[PDB]
Ligand binder design. Structure first.
Ligand SMILES: OC[C@H]1O[C@H](O)[C@@H](O)[C@@H](O)[C@@H]1O
Ligand SMILES: OC[C@H]1O[C@H](O)[C@@H](O)[C@@H](O)[C@@H]1O
Ligand SMILES: OC[C@H]1O[C@H](O)[C@@H](O)[C@@H](O)[C@@H]1O
Lengths: 298, 247, 298, 247, 298, 247
């Protein structure tokens, strides 16, 4: 009858939602593993155990932390369809697929690219100083927030589907989606610019400066005065060396910094839109990088 | 050095390895994978600095939708072991951070092969599922988790019983065209991880926010925390305007 | 009958709203002083003079410049309650208390932290050049705008309370409150970051660089060439000294500049929310600063 | 140096002292307290530079809700007198600004004691108020204003008849722990002044603007005037959006 | 009957809308030249050709590219007024004047200050590297978008005036005006700050630093050590020279960079509001610049 | 050098001159006026760099509402000819860019006189318009266009048959007060061009955006393209808010 200390076990086993991760079917075995006590308590005499394993081993990929809503809605539906014979085998899958994309899109940026980076930076602030309280706080706060979120969302999903129709488009449960999307777009653009190194290394031109730019490092006063003259002339803006070495990176940076990064991100997005598997794309990035370094573009 | 130290470090390496794809308690994070491995090896304050330094880089290394991130767990343990075995607990931090990053050649392939090797595991799971033996799936799952932990457990044990330099690797690597090509490709894979999530959520209403974030992320003035706070503030302002503006 | 050249005297005495400033009762004696001609003209034969002094010596603390609305509403009520025997002796206080918070909150940022900084910077622009027109313009413009605001707002408050019900929630008189709040929050955050010096001075680690970072100032060419080599290598990014001195300030600045400033501001806000007098808080800042410098934290 | 000069400077110092808490005609501001005291002492162009330099610091020194600000009036006159008596009208500006700031130890306590000394003044005011003698309240208020002016009038007169440096103060100050601790505490008290006004207006609708302002105030690119203009522009945009968005 | 290959000729001659540009009547002869084939085909026997020439040689200045809507509306009205005796000869001018201001205001920023700078920068990115692809792409893309706009807007204006009443205030055709205005104001403010050189060159004060600011270029170690001492001291923040040269430009930049630029732009706006011809204003800028350099202000 | 080269360069100079006010095909732009003139004169890669360098400056040089822009077309050809005649294809780029800019004294008035010389042209056009000879207007228009092209055709031809430096111009210029006064005045005329268009669109709803743009254009961090993208993003956000906020 789905006692409380059964959803305790279900939520604790949800910690192992991953582990059986596979390219063919993603997070299916882990999802089955997190539902095992629910099968154990409510079913009997083995005719429908196999059907349970079949209907809890299909494709299911979402953010690991925000997955307890599904794990609660499935219990809410199953505890009632057995006691009342309203078995569907298709609405329990329809709810799984309908809450697949949006929940992943509201959980991935918030947890991976919003809370993870800020908590890691805060922890490394004290950690880079040698203080253990940094990592201790990171660990404790992260665990508290994940466990609280999973428990609250699971017990909210335990509520029947009569409430999920209003608890899918708010109100408040839809505004959070838009806010998370905006915050994720901001942080993701920042990450794309800052942490995608496509630093080119060609050389465009080697032009010697006119006799009005270089410091003339052959006629300075000798000893404690030429030093000051050179420093003041550098602060004026005189070109350091005789040849103004120019790189394609410098020319590209004059439009927008990190143009190659955003161009590559858009190319990868377009490739993913063509149903290409990300593994092939990652191998393509590796091969293009190595052949570019061989040629000399990078 | 001691028999207790090796078993403790391999056990915590196994735990970090399983957390590598479990990604729940975050032992695989260098903020934790480098302090637990430093607390038990003696010098503790000499490893928290390295953990923080690697955590700063490790931001934005999420595994997004079947797209892996470079050296989520292997680097955190591998750099720390080299730091603690070779001395210079504080002076060797740059040496360890200069070897943690280029392990993507042995970090991404080594994890993706493990991820694709578990397809027969779920096939056997279904095979035992037709007969309805639900006691075997709950064993196969931890079997897969342990197999995942092996990929970090084995190299951790190997590092102790080899010279503490580990920048040789039997062959001195292809003549300076592979070791740097793989490195420069390792700084590019994360884009794919971004490319999916940006594709996951993309409407004409939020693209200008992407443009603003990509612009205001310019030279060396605003930190990552500052940009995150700016994004939160802009999102809150937009939601406040939208809530009253609807009607 | 409250002639105009009585309101002239009242407004001019409103310039001395402060001066009798006290922690027990703030700006009460000054408020009584600015109302003396109103009592003089309207009352007689001394029975109710003392009542006026008692009813005009209670708590009244607000922004000195935006206080003439109250000084106009008090005359507006007083001139008609005596001529008509509609004495209230609590509505004259209720209208005072009601316009305490919002008026202070719209006046303090605008005058102290919006017009004062801009006018001071504009005046010091010419003043830093030696030109007297800077300070002259600062004085003249500030006094002109102050006197005009006091005059116009006092005449607007002279209008009866039948209009103040619409002249309290606009419309236009409430939108200005929100705009002033936004501008004040922006400028106050800027001031909190820029002008709260909590510069720490510990030292975390003293690590010697590897032989790939320092310029190695022991093999440079001697005379006008080592100079160029060192300058170019510094422009490359090589560390100046063999030891990388790291401070807690540098580690804290990597998250957000001035984190200690905003933390201290939030702590002081929380202390003020506990009804703690600001004098005790200021003494607390002095004592914490001195003990921190004694220990070495600051 | 002349008998007219001393009386003029003490008179204007008294005016600045009363304006210190009157804060109406802004004589206490260094932009005016240093040019009036420089015009009458001879060298005029040598004091406007100091006035502007101290005015730059003096921004954000408001007395907000029973929270005093460091050296609103005392510093402006005290630094100017030292500058004009000791020569180097233009070269001594850094020397004068290096003594104006550390006077918070003698500037904040000296004003707060005067502010709390007027409680018996209003007590006697009420005492005369019961009998209805309204001609004495208008004299007690002026006496309070004069007492407020005394706290600046006295040190100004003292500075003339002492050595022109005044960096000694009888005792050479506690051994380098008090004179710098008070200095570092003087740069922190202003937070309390902000803490109240930020507490005065604080809604969930304007906090994101606080975050944006605290972010965009980063290194050495935007001046204070630029940040003020940015805040005005953001406020105007928000109000324009809200006016049409309501309905 | 206004065949398609007559509108093609009209659009091609619209490329020569300028060329007969005059201060007395701006872009009148070019507008007449762009309507010659239409007048040729539809009119006859020379009585009304002179009236047409008088009617298509009045004042008409707008953006050269966004002018084909006018050239289409005039054709639509003329092809119907002659065939039906609906001669108006003031409404065809009223429609010309009515779309004078808004079209210029939506075309000038978008083309001159939005698309021109972006394509110029993109082309010069590759051009500064020596690649012809930069200028080739600039030429091809700019001319493609120009011809496409000039043709599509012309054929949209060929639609009768019954649609222009809805195609003047959208909807969508008015929101674009506001967006273009916002973008234009942003880019124009950026251009005013960045590319208006009013660099002053007076000197305010020449003050010698105290014995705590300058490097003391008289006691440094001799040879490869004084270099290190001086460089570290400069990185600390010590003033390079004994005399702190201060300019009016430095004092002016402390308020806002480019205050003189925005002040001059506002002055020129005010002069233009007084119906003063821009020629006199340009001559005034030249004369004020030369006399300022003579005096020494600039 | 060759007879074909001179006729090609004068032909393309005439084309650029007509495009100077035609402003449709954009030959007058230095990004095109310096590469066509470099392709036919031999060294091609030595002129594209100069074209890009001058195109960087040439942004924001629009002729707005009877307000001309400094050296739209004359500089692009004049600097390129000097660069190609005197050698130093890559080393002479700063020399050519230091001569193109100060030609506003000979570039702005040279076009203004040509624009004002067309008043008799339009008068004669109207004179022929009364009689209805519509074949003469379509000749007078091209006569005006060719007259416009002459102002660039003549100096281009002159530059070939004079010394390749042309930094003298018969008289060595007024003693150092005219040659720099004209230069500093050339950097101010564009403001007038802006002043009109800013006057063309100016509402109380868009002025805060002007303030934001004038603020965020501060020191050396955001490029022109970045500011343009920021403006587009802000405009799109404002329009998205306004669409749903109206009602
Ligand atoms: O959220 C999508 C989800 O996709 C995969 O299962 C893994 O990469 C997870 O880490 C990720 O969270
Ligand atoms: O506005 C509140 C008010 O509080 C006190 O009376 C003084 O500090 C004033 O300067 C301040 O304006
Ligand atoms: O749009 C206004 C228009 O005015 C004049 O005709 C010319 O300067 C054009 O280049 C400009 O586009």
């Amino acid at each position: 009858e789905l006692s409380k200390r059964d959803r305790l076990r279900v939520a604790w086993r949800s910690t192992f939602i991953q582990g059986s991760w596979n390219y063919e079917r993603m997070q299916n075995g882990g999802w089955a593993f997190s539902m095992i006590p629910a099968i154990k308590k409510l079913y009997k005499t083995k005719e429908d155990r196999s059907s349970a394993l079949k209907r809890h081993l299909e494709f299911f990929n979402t953010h690991p932390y925000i997955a307890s809503p599904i794990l609660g809605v499935t219990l809410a539906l199953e505890e009632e369809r057995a006691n009342g014979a309203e078995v569907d085998d298709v609405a329990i899958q329809g709810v799984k697929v309908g809450m697949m994309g949006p929940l992943a899109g509201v959980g991935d940026p918030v947890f991976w690219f919003t809370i993870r980076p800020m908590l890691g930076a805060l922890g490394a602030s004290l950690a880079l100083s040698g203080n253990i309280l940094g990592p201790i706080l990171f660990f404790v706060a992260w665990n508290v927030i994940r466990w609280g979120f999973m428990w609250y969302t699971q017990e909210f999903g335990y509520k029947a589907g009569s409430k999920i129709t209003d608890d899918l488009s708010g109100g408040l449960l839809q505004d959070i989606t838009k806010g998370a999307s905006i915050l994720g777009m901001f942080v993701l653009a920042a990450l794309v610019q800052r942490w995608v190194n496509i630093q080119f290394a060609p050389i465009i031109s080697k032009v010697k400066l006119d006799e009005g730019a270089y410091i003339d490092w052959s006629h300075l006063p000798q000893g404690a005065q030429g030093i000051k003259t050179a420093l003041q002339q550098q602060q004026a803006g005189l070109a350091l060396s005789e040849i103004k070495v120019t790189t394609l990176q410098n020319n590209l940076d004059n439009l927008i910094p990190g143009l190659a990064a955003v161009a590559l991100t858009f190319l990868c997005m377009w490739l993913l839109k063509k149903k290409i598997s990300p593994i092939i794309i990652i191998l393509g990035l590796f091969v293009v990088g190595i052949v570019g370094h061989l040629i000399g573009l990078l | 050095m001691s028999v207790i130290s090796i078993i403790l470090v391999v056990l915590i390496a196994f735990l970090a390895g399983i957390e590598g794809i479990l990604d729940e308690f975050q032992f695989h994070q260098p903020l934790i994978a480098c302090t637990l491995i430093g607390l038990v090896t003696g010098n503790l304050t000499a490893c928290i600095i390295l953990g923080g330094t690697l955590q700063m880089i490790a931001l934005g290394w999420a595994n997004i939708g079947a797209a892996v991130a470079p050296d989520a767990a292997l680097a955190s343990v591998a750099s720390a072991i080299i730091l603690v075995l070779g001395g210079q607990g504080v002076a060797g931090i740059p040496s360890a951070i200069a070897i943690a990053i280029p392990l993507a050649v042995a970090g991404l392939f080594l994890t993706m092969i493990v991820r694709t090797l578990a397809v027969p595991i779920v096939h056997l799971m279904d095979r035992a599922a037709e007969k309805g033996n639900i006691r075997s799936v709950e064993w196969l799952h931890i079997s897969a988790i342990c197999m995942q932990g092996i990929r970090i457990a084995i190299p951790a044990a190997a590092l102790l019983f080899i010279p503490a330099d580990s920048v040789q690797s039997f062959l001195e690597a292809m003549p300076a065209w592979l070791t740097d090509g793989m490195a420069i490709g390792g700084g590019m894979v994360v884009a794919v991880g971004y490319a999916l999530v940006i594709n996951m959520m993309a409407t004409k209403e939020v693209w200008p926010f992407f443009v603003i974030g990509f612009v205001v992320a310019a030279i060396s003035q605003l930190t990552l925390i500052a940009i995150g706070a700016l994004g939160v503030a802009l999102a809150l302002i937009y939601l406040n305007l939208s809530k009253m503006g609807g009607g």
